[PDB]
Write a structure and sequence with these properties.
This protein is mainly beta. It is built from four helices and 17 strands. The strands form three sheets. Strands 1, 2, 3, 4, 6 and 8 form a six-stranded antiparallel beta sheet that branches. Strands 12, 13, 14, 15, 16 and 17 form a six-stranded antiparallel beta sheet that branches. It is classed as protein transport.
Length: 274
Amino acid sequence: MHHHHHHMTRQEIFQEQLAAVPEFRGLGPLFKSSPEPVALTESETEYVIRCTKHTFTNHMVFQFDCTNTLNDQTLENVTVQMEPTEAYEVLCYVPARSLPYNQPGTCYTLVALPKEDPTAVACTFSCMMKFTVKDCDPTTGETDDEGYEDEYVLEDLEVTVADHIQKVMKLNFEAAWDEVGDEFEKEETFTLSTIKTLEEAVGNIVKFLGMHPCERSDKVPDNKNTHTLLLAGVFRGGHDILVRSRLLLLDTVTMQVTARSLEELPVDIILASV
Ligand SMILES: [Mg+2]
């Protein structure tokens, strides 16, 4: 046999970084990280704040990679305070100790996932940078050690169902469907009373759920007013979540959505979210 060398993935690298923060020691394995960050300030403003969402089994860590672009200040003890609309609970802030001009640094916010009503995955967080400002001379580097506390309002951060699911390919959706079986199979019919094409309905569902459309089911053929969308993912904690939507277009769209998993909670989440 030929022996390959292991190359670390993006997820393995984040896992290593996060396992090195003492506050995150008991979170269990990293489940997923958002494939691209979100900017929480407008372009060409004082700060660049790039947020990556890291999902664990029962928690989420929000990583903020932060740049102070102003040459007449250094920021210290920087966090991004987060206030949720729903029952996510902030547990810990890990600050960036120092943000000198044009030297990026990372802070984190740790939150628990909703316990009492675990289907409540949608949440909006009001975000505010909190920090100490120390004036410094742009040319001399000289810093005034008498700092003061300040804050800076950021854009809201949205968390959705797509943050709790990792997309996964299934080449044979029906085999996967059968393998999971029907112990927690649930179906709900939804009326999409504003939507007048199958293409819009399918595109919207695929984007919202953040699951993988199997067997080219994200492509609607011409001459058809019926269609079946087949979606696959893995829910946090490692169990597959599979969704079938049977859509019918008559003036507008109606659909029968069925979900299967070995775990009841993701099925409930899909149906509540859609
Ligand atoms: Mg200034």
